[PDB]
Design a protein around this ligand. Sequence first.
Ligand SMILES: [Li+]
Length: 188
Amino acid sequence: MTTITGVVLAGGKARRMGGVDKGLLELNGKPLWQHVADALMTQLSHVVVNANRHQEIYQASGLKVIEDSLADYPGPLAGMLSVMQQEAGEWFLFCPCDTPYIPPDLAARLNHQRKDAPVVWVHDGERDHPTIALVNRAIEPLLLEYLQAGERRVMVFMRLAGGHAVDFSDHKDAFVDVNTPEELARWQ
Ligand SMILES: [Li+]
């Protein structure tokens, strides 16, 4: 019913008994994934989270938790596909669980700059963030074919799908990512 579903990508696998659950690390008392979810809810009515560990903890804030298919495909594309297979609706705005400062015009600017492409993603002036991506439904069969072929590379896929980068270089620091607990400590 709404146009774009927001999706927080809070990782798959647990390729050694998980280890650190990055989405649940807390920034000012609030799990990183929830910072992302709250920022997406500012701009979108329907937001879900892809998480494959500690699902009960993710389920605590009342959002739908989507788990990866048993295919166990590699990398962030696997979560994107699992969500498209389990959610209706024509557009998805994906964002990883570690970029807590994403801006309230993320969806609007990506949509304004889509210019007929089926996929666009954020470029922050220094690097591509191909997992912060507005993706049309039509990408679902292409993703499934790519992952079934044994591929994993995210940027390569986004290029094959006919996507382009959208320039968010004017958004100072909105796309900083917190990759480690060590990094997290610096933003408290
Ligand atoms: Li554990």
